Amino acid sequence: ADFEVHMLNKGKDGAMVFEPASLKVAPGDTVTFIPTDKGHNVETIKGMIPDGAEAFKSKINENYKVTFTAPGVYGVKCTPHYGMGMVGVVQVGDAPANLEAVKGAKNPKKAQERLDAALAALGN
């Protein structure tokens, strides 16, 4: 299954957002992060990727397709707008084993507000 996440300057949740900001996919599914607005990328957040997965970082303005392999919760950010809260969460598969350690990861205040909302949106 293929899903799309749009990178926008402004959306329903305020400035600098990924829409949707919370998504659940199956192990092996692909998500394309689309630069609807220019000046954004996607990068995994330190401490917010499961065991066996590798970190990734796309280039500014590229349409970036990612096939999620390792099951778990992945926190993603937009590099330049991380301090402004441009973040999202991708849950891969059921019963993520790192969900509890992703909740304790440290992020700038605006990003933490949005991550907490996104994490609660998946059933915590």
Q: Tell me if 86 contacts Cu ion by CB under 5 A.
A: yes
Q: Pick one of 42, 76, 78, 92: the residue that binds Cu ion (CB under 5 A).
A: 78
Q: Could you tell me whether strands 2-11 and 30-34 are parallel, antiparallel, or unpaired per DSSP bridges?
A: parallel
What are the φ/ψ torsions at residue 102 (nearest 5 degrees)? -70, -40
> Is there a binding annotation on residue 48?
no
Interaction pattern, residues 23-42, with Cu ion; x per rule: CB under 5 A: -----------------x--
Name the minimum Å distance from CB 47 to Cu ion: 20
By the rule CB under 5 A, 110 interacts with Cu ion: no
Asked if residue 76 binds Cu ion (CB under 5 A), the reply is no
Nearer of residues 34 and 86 to Cu ion, judged by Cβ: 86
Write out the two tokens for 113.
Answer: 């507000």
E runs forming strands in the chain: 2-11, 14-19, 22-25, 30-34, 43-44, 64-67, 72-77, 87-92
